[PDB]
C-alpha cells in the first residue's frame, strides 16, 4: 500500500544527482556533500579516510532518515586545502587500499589452495 520498491535504496531517480556539493557558510572551508542512494557503507569509509588527512579539520556523515536513501558528509579542511580536494583524495585512497586488499586476497587464496 505504501511499501517503496526495494530498488529505490540503490537506484537514482531520473534527474536526481548522485552527489551535490553545497558550501557551508557557518565556518570557512567547509562543504556538505549530499550523496543520494548511498548509506553507511560508503559514508563510514569516506568519513574515516577523511579523518586520516591532517588537513581535514572536520569529517562527519549522517543518514538524516533511515527511510530516506541519502547521506550527508560534512568536510572542513584547513584554509590552504579544500573539502572537495579532501573528498577526492579520500576516495582515491580508499580505491587504492581496496585494490591492494583485493590483490593480496587473491595472492592469499592462491597460496591457500596451492599450499
Q: How far apart are CA 44 and CA 108, in angstroms?
A: 27
> According to CB under 8 A, which residues from 16 to 45 bind another protein?
17-21, 24, 26-27, 30, 35, 38, 40-42, 44-45
Q: How many CA atoms lie within 13 A of 65 on its CB side?
A: 3
User: Does position 87 bind another protein by CB under 8 A?
Assistant: yes
Give the DSSP letter of residue 13.
P
User: What's the grid cell of residue 97?
Assistant: 587500499
Query: By three-state DSSP, how is residue 59 classified?
Result: strand
User: Does position 100 bind another protein by CB under 8 A?
Assistant: yes
Pick one of 15, 68, 97, 115: the residue that binds another protein (CB under 8 A): 97
User: Does position 9 bind another protein by CB under 8 A?
Assistant: yes
Q: What are phi and psi of 49, to 5 degrees?
A: -70, -40
**Stretch (H or E) spanning 30:** strand 30-36
Chain residues in the site for another protein (CB under 8 A): 1-2, 6-7, 9-11, 17-21, 24, 26-27, 30, 35, 38, 40-42, 44-45, 47-49, 51-55, 57-62, 72, 74, 76, 78, 84, 87-89, 91-102, 104-109, 111-113
Amino acid at each position: 500500500m505504501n511499501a517503496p520498491p526495494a530498488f529505490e535504496s540503490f537506484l537514482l531517480f531520473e534527474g536526481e544527482k548522485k552527489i551535490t556539493i553545497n558550501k557551508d557558510t557557518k565556518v570557512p572551508n567547509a562543504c556538505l556533500f549530499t550523496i543520494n542512494k548511498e548509506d553507511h557503507t560508503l559514508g563510514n569509509i569516506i568519513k574515516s579516510q577523511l579523518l586520516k588527512d591532517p588537513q581535514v579539520l572536520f569529517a562527519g556523515y549522517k543518514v538524516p532518515h533511515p527511510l530516506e536513501h541519502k547521506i550527508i558528509i560534512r568536510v572542513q579542511t584547513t584554509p590552504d586545502y579544500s573539502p572537495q580536494e579532501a573528498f577526492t583524495n579520500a576516495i582515491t585512497d580508499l580505491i587504492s587500499e581496496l585494490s591492494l586488499l583485493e590483490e593480496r586476497f587473491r595472492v592469499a587464496i592462491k597460496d591457500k589452495q596451492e599450499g
